[PDB]
Coordinates of C-alpha atoms and ligand atoms in Angstrom, one line a residue:
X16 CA 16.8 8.9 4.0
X17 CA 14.8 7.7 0.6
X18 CA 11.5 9.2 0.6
X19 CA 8.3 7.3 -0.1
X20 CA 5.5 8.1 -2.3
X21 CA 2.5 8.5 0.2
X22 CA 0.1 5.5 -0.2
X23 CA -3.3 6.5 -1.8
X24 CA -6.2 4.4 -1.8
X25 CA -10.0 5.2 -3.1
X26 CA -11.9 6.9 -0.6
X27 CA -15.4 6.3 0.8
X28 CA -16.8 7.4 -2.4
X29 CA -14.5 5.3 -4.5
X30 CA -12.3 9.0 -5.1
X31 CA -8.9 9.7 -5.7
X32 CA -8.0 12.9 -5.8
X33 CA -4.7 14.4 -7.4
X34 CA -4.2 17.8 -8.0
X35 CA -1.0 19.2 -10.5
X36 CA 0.7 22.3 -8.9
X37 CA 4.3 23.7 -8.9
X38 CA 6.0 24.4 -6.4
X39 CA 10.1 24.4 -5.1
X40 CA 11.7 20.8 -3.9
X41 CA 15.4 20.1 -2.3
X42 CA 17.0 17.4 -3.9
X43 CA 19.9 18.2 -1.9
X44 CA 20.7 19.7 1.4
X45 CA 21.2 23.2 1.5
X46 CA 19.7 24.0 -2.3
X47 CA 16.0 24.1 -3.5
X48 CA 14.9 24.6 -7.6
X49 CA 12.0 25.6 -9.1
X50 CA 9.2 22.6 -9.6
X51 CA 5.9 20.8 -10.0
X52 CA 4.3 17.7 -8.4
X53 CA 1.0 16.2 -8.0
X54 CA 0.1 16.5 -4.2
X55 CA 3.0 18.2 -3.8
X56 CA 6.0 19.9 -5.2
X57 CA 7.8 17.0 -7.1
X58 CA 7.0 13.8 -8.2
X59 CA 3.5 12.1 -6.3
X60 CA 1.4 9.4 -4.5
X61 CA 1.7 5.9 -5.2
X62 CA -1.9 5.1 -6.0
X63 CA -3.0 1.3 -5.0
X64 CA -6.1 0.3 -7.2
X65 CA -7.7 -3.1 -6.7
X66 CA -8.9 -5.3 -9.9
X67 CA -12.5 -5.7 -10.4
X68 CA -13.0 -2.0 -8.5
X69 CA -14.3 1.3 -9.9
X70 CA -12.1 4.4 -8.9
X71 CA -12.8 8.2 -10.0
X72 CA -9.4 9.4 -10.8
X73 CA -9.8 13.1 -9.5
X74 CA -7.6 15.8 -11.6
X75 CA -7.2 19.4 -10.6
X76 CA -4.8 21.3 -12.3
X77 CA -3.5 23.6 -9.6
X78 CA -1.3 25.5 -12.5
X79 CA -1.5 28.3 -14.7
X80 CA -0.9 26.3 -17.5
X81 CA -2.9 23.1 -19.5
X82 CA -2.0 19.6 -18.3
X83 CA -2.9 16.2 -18.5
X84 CA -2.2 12.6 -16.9
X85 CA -1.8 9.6 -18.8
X86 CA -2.3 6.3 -17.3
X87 CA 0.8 4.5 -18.3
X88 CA -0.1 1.0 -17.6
X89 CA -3.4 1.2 -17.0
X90 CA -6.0 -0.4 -19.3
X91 CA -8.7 1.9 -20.1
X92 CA -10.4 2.8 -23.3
X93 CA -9.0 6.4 -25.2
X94 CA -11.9 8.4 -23.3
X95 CA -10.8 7.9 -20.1
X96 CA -7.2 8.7 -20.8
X97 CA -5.5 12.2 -21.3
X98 CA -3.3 13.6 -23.5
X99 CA -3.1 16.4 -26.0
X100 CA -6.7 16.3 -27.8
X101 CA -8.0 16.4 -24.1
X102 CA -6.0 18.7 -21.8
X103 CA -7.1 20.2 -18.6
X104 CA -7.1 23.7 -19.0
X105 CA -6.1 25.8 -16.1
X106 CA -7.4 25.8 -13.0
X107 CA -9.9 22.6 -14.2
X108 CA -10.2 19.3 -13.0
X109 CA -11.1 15.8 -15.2
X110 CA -12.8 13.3 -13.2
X111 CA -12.5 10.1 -15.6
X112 CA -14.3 6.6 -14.1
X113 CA -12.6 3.6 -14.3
X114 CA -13.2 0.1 -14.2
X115 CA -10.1 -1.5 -13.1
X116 CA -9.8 -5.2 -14.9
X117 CA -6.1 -5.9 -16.0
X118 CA -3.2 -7.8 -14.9
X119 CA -1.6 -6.9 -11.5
X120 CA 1.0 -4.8 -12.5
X121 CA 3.4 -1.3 -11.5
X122 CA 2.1 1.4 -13.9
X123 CA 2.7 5.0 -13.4
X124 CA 1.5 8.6 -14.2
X125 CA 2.6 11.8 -15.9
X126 CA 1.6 14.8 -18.3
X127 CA 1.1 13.9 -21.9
X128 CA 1.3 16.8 -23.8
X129 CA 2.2 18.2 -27.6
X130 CA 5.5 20.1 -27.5
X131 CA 5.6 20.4 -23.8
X132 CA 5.8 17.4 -22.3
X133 CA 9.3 17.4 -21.5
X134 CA 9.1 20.2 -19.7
X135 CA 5.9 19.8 -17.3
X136 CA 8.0 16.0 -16.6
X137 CA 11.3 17.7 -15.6
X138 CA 9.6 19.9 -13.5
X139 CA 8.3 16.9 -11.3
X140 CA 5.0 15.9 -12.7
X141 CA 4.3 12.0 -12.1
X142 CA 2.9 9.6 -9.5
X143 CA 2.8 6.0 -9.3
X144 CA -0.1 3.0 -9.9
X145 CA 0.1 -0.5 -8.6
X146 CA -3.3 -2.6 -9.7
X147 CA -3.0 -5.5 -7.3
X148 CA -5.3 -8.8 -7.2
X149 CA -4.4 -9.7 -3.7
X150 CA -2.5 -12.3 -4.5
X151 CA 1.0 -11.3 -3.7
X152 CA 1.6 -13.4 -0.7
X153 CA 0.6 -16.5 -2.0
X154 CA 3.0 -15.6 -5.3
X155 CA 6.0 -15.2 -2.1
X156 CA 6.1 -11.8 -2.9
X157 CA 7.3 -9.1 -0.2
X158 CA 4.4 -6.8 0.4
X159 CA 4.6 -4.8 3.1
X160 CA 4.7 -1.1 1.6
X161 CA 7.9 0.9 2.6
X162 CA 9.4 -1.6 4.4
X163 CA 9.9 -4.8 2.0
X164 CA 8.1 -3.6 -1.1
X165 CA 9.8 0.0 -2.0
X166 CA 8.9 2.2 -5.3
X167 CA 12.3 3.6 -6.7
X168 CA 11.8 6.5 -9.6
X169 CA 14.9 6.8 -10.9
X170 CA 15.7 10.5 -12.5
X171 CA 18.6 12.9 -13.5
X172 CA 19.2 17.0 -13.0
X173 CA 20.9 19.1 -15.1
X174 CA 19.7 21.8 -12.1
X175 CA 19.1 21.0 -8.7
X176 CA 18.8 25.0 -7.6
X177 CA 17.4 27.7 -9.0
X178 CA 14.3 28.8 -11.5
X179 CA 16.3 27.5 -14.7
X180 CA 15.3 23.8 -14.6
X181 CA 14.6 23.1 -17.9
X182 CA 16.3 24.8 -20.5
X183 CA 17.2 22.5 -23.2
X184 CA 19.6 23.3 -26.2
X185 CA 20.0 22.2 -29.8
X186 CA 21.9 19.3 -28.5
X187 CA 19.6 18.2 -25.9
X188 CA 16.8 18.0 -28.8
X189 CA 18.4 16.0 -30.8
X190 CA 20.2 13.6 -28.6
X191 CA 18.0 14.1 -25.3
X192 CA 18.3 16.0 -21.8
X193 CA 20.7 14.3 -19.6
X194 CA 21.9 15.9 -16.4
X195 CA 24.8 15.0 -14.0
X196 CA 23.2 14.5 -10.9
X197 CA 21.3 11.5 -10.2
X198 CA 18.5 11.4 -8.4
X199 CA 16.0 8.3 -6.5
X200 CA 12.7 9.5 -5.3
X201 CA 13.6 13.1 -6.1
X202 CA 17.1 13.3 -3.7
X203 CA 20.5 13.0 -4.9
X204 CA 22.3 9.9 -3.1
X205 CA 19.4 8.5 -0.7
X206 CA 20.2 5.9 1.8
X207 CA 17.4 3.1 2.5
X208 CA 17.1 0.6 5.4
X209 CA 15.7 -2.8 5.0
X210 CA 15.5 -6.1 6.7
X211 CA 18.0 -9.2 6.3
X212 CA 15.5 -10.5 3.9
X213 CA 14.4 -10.7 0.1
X214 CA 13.2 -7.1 -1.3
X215 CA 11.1 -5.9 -3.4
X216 CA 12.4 -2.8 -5.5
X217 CA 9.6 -1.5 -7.9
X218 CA 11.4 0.4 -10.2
X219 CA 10.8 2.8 -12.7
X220 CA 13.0 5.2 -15.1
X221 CA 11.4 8.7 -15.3
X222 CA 14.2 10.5 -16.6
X223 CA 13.9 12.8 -20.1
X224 CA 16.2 10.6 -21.6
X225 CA 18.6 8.7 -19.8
X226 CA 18.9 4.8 -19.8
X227 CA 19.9 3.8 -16.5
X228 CA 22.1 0.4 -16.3
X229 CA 21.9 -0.5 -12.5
X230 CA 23.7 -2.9 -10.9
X231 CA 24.5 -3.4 -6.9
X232 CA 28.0 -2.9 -6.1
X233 CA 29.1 -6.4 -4.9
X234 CA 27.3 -7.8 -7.9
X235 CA 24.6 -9.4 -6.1
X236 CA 21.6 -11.1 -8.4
X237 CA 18.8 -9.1 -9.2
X238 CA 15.9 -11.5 -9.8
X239 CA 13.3 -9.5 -12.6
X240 CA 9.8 -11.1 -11.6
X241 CA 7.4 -8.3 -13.7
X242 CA 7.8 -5.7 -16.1
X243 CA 5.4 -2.8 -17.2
X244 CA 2.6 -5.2 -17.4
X245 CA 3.4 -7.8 -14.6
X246 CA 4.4 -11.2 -13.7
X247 CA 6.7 -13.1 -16.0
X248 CA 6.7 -16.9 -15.0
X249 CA 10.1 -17.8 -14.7
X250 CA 11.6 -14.9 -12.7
X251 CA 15.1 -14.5 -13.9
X252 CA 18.4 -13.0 -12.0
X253 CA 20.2 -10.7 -13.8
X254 CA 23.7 -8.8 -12.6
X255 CA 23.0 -5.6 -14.2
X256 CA 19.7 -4.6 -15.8
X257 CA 18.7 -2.3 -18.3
X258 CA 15.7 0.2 -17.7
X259 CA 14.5 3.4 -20.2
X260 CA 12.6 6.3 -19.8
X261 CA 9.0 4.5 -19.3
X262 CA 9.6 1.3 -18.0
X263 CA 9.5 -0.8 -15.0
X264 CA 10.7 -3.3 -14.2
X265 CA 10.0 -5.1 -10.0
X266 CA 12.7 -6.8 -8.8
X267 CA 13.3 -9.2 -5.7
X268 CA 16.9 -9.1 -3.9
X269 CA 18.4 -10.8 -0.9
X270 CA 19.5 -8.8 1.9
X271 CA 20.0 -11.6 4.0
X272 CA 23.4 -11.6 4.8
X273 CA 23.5 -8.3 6.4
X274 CA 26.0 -6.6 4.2
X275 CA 25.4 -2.8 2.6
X276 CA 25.6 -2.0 -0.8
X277 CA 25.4 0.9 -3.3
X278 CA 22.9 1.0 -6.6
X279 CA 24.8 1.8 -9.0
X280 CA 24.4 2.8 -13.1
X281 CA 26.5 2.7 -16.0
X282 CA 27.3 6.9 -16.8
X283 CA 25.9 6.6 -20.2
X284 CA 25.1 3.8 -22.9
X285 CA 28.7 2.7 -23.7
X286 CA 30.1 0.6 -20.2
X287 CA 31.4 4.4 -19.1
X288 CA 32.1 4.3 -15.2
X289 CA 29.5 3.8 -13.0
X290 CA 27.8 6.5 -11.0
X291 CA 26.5 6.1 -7.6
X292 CA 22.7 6.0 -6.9
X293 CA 21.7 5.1 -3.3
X294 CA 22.7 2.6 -0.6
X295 CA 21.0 0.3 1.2
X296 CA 21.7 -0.4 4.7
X297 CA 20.3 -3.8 6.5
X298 CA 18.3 -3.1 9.8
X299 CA 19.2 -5.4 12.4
X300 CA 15.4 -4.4 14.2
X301 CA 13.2 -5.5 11.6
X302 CA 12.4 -8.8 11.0
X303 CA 11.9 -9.6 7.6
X304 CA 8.8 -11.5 6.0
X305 CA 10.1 -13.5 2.9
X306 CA 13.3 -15.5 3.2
X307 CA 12.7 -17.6 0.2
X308 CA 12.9 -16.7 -3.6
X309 CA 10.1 -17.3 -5.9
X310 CA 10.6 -19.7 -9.1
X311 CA 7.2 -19.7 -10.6
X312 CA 4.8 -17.0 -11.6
X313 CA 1.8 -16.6 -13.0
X314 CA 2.9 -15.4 -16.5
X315 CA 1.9 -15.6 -20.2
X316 CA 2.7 -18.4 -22.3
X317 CA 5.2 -17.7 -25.1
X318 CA 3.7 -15.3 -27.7
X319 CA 2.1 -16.9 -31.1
X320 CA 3.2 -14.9 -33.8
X321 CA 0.8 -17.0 -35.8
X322 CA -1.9 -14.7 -34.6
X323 CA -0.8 -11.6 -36.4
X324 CA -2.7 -10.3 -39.4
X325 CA -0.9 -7.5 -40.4
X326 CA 2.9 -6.6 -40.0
X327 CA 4.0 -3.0 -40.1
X328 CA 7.1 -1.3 -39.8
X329 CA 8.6 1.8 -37.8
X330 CA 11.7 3.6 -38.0
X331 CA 13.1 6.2 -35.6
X332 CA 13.5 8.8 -37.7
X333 CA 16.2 11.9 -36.1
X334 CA 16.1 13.4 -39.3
X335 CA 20.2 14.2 -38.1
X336 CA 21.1 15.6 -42.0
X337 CA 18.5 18.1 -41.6
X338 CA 19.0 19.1 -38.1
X339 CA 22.5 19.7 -37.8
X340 CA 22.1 22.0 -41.1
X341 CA 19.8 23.8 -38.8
X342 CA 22.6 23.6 -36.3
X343 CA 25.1 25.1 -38.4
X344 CA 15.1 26.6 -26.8
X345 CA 11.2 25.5 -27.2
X346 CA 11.0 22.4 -29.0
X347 CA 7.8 23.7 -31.0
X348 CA 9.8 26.8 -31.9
X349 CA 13.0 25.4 -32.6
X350 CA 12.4 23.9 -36.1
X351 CA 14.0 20.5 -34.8
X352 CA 12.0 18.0 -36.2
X353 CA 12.2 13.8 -36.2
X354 CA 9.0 11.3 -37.4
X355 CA 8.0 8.0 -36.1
X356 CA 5.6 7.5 -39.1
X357 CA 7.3 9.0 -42.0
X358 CA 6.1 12.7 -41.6
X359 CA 6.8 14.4 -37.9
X360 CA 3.6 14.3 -35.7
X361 CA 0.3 16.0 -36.6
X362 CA -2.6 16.9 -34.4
X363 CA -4.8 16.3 -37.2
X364 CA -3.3 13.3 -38.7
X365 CA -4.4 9.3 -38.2
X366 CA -1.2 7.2 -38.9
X367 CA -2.8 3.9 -37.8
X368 CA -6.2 2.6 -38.3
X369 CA -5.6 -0.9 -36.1
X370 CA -8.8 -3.4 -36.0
X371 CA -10.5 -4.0 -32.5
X372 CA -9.2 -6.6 -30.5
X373 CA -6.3 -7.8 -33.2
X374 CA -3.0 -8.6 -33.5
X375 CA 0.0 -7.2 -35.6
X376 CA 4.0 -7.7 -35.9
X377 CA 5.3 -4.4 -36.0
X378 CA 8.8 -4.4 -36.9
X379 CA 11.1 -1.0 -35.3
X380 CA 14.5 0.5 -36.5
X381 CA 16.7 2.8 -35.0
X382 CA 20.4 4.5 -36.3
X383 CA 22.3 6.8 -34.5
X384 CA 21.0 5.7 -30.7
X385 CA 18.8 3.4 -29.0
X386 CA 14.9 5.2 -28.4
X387 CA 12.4 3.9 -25.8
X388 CA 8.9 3.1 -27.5
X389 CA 6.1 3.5 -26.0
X390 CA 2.3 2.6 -27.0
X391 CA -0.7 3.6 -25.8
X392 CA -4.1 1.6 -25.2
X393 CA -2.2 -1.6 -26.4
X394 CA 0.4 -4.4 -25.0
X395 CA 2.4 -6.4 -26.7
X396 CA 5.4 -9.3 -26.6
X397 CA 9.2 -8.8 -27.5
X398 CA 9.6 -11.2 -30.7
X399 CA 13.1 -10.8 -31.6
X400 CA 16.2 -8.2 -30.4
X401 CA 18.7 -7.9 -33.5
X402 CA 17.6 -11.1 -34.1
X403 CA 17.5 -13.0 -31.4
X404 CA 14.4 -13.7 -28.9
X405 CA 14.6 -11.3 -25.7
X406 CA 15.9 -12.6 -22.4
X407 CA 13.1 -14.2 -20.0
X408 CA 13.0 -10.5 -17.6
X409 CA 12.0 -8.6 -20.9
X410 CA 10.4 -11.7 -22.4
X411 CA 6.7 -10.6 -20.8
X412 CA 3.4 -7.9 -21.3
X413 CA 5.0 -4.7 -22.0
X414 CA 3.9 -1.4 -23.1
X415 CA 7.8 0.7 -23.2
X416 CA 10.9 -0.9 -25.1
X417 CA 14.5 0.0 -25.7
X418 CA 15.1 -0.5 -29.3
X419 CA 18.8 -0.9 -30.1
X420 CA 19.2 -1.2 -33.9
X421 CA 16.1 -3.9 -34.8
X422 CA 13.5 -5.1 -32.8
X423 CA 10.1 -7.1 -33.4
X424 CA 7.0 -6.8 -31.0
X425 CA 3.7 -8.6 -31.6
X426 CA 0.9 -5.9 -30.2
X427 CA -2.7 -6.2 -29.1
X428 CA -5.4 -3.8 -29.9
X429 CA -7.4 -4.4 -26.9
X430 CA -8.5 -0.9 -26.0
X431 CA -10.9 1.1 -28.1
X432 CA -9.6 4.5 -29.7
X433 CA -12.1 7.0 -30.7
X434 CA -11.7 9.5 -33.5
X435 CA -11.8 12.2 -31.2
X436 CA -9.3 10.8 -28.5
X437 CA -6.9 8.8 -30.8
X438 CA -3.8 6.7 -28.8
X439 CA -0.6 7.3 -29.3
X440 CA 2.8 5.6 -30.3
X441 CA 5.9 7.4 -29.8
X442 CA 9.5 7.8 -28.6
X443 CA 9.8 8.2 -24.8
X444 CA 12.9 10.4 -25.3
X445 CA 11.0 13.8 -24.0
X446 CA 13.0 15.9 -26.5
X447 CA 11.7 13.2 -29.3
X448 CA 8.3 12.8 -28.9
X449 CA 8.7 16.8 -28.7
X450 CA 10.0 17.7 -31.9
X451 CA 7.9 15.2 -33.8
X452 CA 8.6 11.4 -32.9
X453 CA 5.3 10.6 -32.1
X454 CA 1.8 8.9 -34.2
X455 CA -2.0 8.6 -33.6
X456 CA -3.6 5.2 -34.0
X457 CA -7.3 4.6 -33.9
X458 CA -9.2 0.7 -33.4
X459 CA -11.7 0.0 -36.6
Ligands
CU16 CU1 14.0 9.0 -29.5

């Protein structure tokens, strides 16, 4: 059966309390590896926060190493968020206050480290973060948690048992860590049961590095209504969709007519064969809430470009002639390095200085592959995709983007960045942002 993330909601005292530990987790019958979770052994709670509500996010790290959470979605000025000038030494906890006020939306959790972040994620570390504004039912959105309105983290294992989880080569630095086995909600081929009725799937790619390419085996539409940060308003169907490490993307599809089916995803980013991910079986018992798909959402307006007043550029630098000489592991160690901004990551080096509460056109360029970017403490709009504007179900706010080639995203600064906490922009490959693909931006 597909395993749910436990609900989680502020307590009495407006607490919620998640705790980092490791642990060992079965992803298959029979075998058990080496892990880490938060409230457990591998992956965590899905967290429900209301807007307008306060909420102490509780951190204990449980480990014997530092940690941190970043709250991937989440809008929240640099102080409340962590990451690598802020980590929670061992045995700590970091009890940031928030005041939730942001678009409903399905954000997420996980560590945020330098050098070592692909490692604490592989072992398990993330949870999920749906802000709601109560308004789901009059949108005609299924809502009923686990049973019409299911979280699915999609991931892949180069290990499923054993200690050896994590144990990246030259290779997997430079191209990313990619495993056979495919996991949903930390098991290898899960089956769910839902009504004959329209689902919500709220999905997310949490993988190292794999793009997942999902489609359901008799081709049925899958109608996008939100990405990372929410509603779009024209929902649009798609046949396949495309998600990377960092995204999300919620989905609505019809189970109405009874039939099972299989998830399935592209085996890599060429059209390869597609590899099984779960099934779905329809539950004569239940009887379903929504029979009726949603046109209209309440979405942003087409994005002004007219607002920019400053236009920067980005390339996704794999520095391939100097690595493959180095060719011919621990990331830090390794001397792999990539940039984002011209010189590989520093710790002690600003690469942005962004004004308050502006807007800028920030052109990105890739080469050899496609990488995932990611941006902290800011939003922004897909302009253009090799040209051409993005398709409605990528169209919205987002904060994680596949960049194939060229791209062209119009951002907003709405988040304040301190000197001493700077955001962060960055490749969401692990093995990237590891060996360097990674910046620091600060708001003027
Ligand atoms: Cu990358």
């Amino acid at each position: 059966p597909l395993p749910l993330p436990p609900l989680v909601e502020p307590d009495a005292s407006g607490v919620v309390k998640l705790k980092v530990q490791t642990g060992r987790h079965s992803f298959e019958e029979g075998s058990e590896a080496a892990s880490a979770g938060i409230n457990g052994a591998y992956l965590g709670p899905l967290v429900r926060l209301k807007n307008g509500e306060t909420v102490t996010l509780s951190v204990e790290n449980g480990m014997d190493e530092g940690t941190t959470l970043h709250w991937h979605g989440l809008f929240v000025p640099s102080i409340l968020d962590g990451g690598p000038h802020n980590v929670i030494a061992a045995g700590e906890a970091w009890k940031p206050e928030v005041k939730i006020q942001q678009p409903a939306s399905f954000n997420w959790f996980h560590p945020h480290l330098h050098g070592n972040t692909a490692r604490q994620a592989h072992l398990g570390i993330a949870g999920l973060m749906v802000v709601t504004d109560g308004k789901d039912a009059e949108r005609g959105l299924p809502e009923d948690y686990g049973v019409d309105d299911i979280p699915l983290v999609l991931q892949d294992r180069r290990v499923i048992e054993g200690d050896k989880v994590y144990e990246p080569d030259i290779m997997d630095l430079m191209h990313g860590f990619r495993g056979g086995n495919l996991i949903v909600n930390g098991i290898v081929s899960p089956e769910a049961r839902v009504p004959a009725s329209i689902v919500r799937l709220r999905i997310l790619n949490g993988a190292n590095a794999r793009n997942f390419h999902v489609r359901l085996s008799d081709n049925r539409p899958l109608l996008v209504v939100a990405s990372d940060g929410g509603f779009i308003g024209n929902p649009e169907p798609v046949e396949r969709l495309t998600i990377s490490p960092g995204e999300r993307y919620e989905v609505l599809v019809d189970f109405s007519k009874g039939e099972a089916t299989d998830l399935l995803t592209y085996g890599d980013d060429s059209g390869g064969d597609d590899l099984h991910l779960m099934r779905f079986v329809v539950d004569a018992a239940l009887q379903g809430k929504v029979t009726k798909r949603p046109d209209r959402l309440d979405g942003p307006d087409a994005p002004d470009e007219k607002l920019s007043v400053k236009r920067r550029s980005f390339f996704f630098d794999e520095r391939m002639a100097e690595n493959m000489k180095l060719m011919m592991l621990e990331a830090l160690t390794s001397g792999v390095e990539m940039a984002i901004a011209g010189k590989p990551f520093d710790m002690d080096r600003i690469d942005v200085e962004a004004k308050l509460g502006s807007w800028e056109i920030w052109d990105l360029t890739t080469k050899e592959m496609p990488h995932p970017f990611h941006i902290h403490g800011a939003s922004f709009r897909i302009l253009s995709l090799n040209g051409k504007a993005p398709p409605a179900h990528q169209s919205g706010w987002k904060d994680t983007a596949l960049i194939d080639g060229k791209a062209e995203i119009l951002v907003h600064f709405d988040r304040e960045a301190v000197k001493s906490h700077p955001f962060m922009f960055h490749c969401h490959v692990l093995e990237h942002e590891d060996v360097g693909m990674m910046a620091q931006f600060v708001t003027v």
